[PDB]
Amino acid sequence: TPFQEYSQKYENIRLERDGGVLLVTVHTEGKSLVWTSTAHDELAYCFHDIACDRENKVVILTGTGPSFCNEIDFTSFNLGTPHDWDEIIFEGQRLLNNLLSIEVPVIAAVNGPVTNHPEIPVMSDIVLAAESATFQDGPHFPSGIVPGDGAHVVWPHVLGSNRGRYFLLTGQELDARTALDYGAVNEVLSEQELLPRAWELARGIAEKPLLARRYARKVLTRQLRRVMEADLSLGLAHEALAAIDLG
């Protein structure tokens, strides 16, 4: 399906493309994204659309306003039965598997705090953070929920073994410069410079030969793909069991 169709399918995702550089901006009515079942499932479907559309040369992922995503509407999720958890398991797999199936480089521009699926931006090939960006996993273990949704794969992968486990268990908040030092972020920029820097990088990548661009991505995500396939759905099933047990 062509850009003109899918670019307007998503209430929580603005999609704008210029010169084959796709800017994907998550949002709730134009304010910082409030995480919902709807935003979750839209991102999974949107990632699929982006991946299937060859005219996307490079992807920039960002939020809007003061936060990337640090608010949630728990009333929007059904977390009580195996029935409802299989819906979450199935689209949770597609969320991260569709992200990794995108075959062009992905740049994150983290504009502010993220506490819901904070692993998504740090799965990108280039990670840029505003001075105010932070990363934190409060909705999992600090809230009595298994970090089994990809968090358990990605954070030890990107922070290393012990920083990753500690981050996940203690609710540590990583600010922009700590994330930079831990190697999860590549550049810290003022808020005003963040998106211009993403576009500059993206344009440079977009100028490279078609197949060079596409294959850079493919050769660079091999190990992440292997560990996601190994551990993601095991995490999700365990997180589901633990969550159902609360009732």
Interaction between residue 74 and its own copies (CB under 8 A): no
Among 14, 17, 203, 208, binds its own copies (CB under 8 A): 208
119 annotated active-site:
yes
Q: For the CB of residue 90, give the shortest distance to its own copies in the complex, in Å.
A: 7
Interaction between residue 126 and its own copies (CB under 8 A): yes
* Tokens coding 215: 């294959």
Q: Are 236 and 97 in contact (CB under 8 A)?
A: no
The H-or-E segment that residue 18 falls in is strand 13-18
Contact letters (x/-) for its own copies, 157-196, by CB under 8 A?
xxxxxxxxxx-xxx-----------xxxxx----------
Check whether 157 is labelled as a binding-site residue. Answer: no
Q: For the CB of residue 23, give the shortest distance to its own copies in the complex, in Å.
A: 18
The end-to-end CA distance of the chain, in Å, is 42
In terms of CB distance, is 52 or 72 closer to its own copies?
Answer: 52
Interaction between residue 26 and its own copies (CB under 8 A): no
Residue 227: partners with Cβ closer than 8 Å, 6 or more residues away: 153, 157
Check whether 149 is labelled as a binding-site residue. Answer: yes
User: CA-CA distance, 113 to 11, in Å (whole number)?
Assistant: 21
User: CA-CA distance, 213 to 217, in Å (whole number)?
Assistant: 7
Q: For the CB of residue 177, give the shortest distance to its own copies in the complex, in Å.
A: 14
110 residue type, one letter: V
Check whether 238 is labelled as a binding-site residue. Answer: no
Q: For the CB of residue 125, give the shortest distance to its own copies in the complex, in Å.
A: 4
- Interactions with its own copies, residue window 211-230 (CB under 8 A): 211-212, 214-216, 218-220, 222-227, 229-230
Interaction between residue 77 and its own copies (CB under 8 A): no
The H-or-E segment that residue 72 falls in is strand 71-72
* Tokens coding 214: 């596409």
User: CA-CA distance, 100 to 217, in Å (whole number)?
Assistant: 9
Stretch that binds its own copies, among 28-36, 42-50, 60-68, 69-77 (CB under 8 A): 42-50
> What pairing do the DSSP bridges indicate for beta strands 126-130 and 187-189?
parallel
Stretch that binds its own copies, among 22-30, 70-78, 112-120, 233-241 (CB under 8 A): 233-241
User: Angle at the Cα of 32 (from 123 to 217), degrees rounded to 5?
Assistant: 20
Among 90, 131, 178, 203, binds its own copies (CB under 8 A): 90
Catalytic residue selected from 5, 16, 71, 119: 119
Enumerate the active-site residues.
Answer: 119
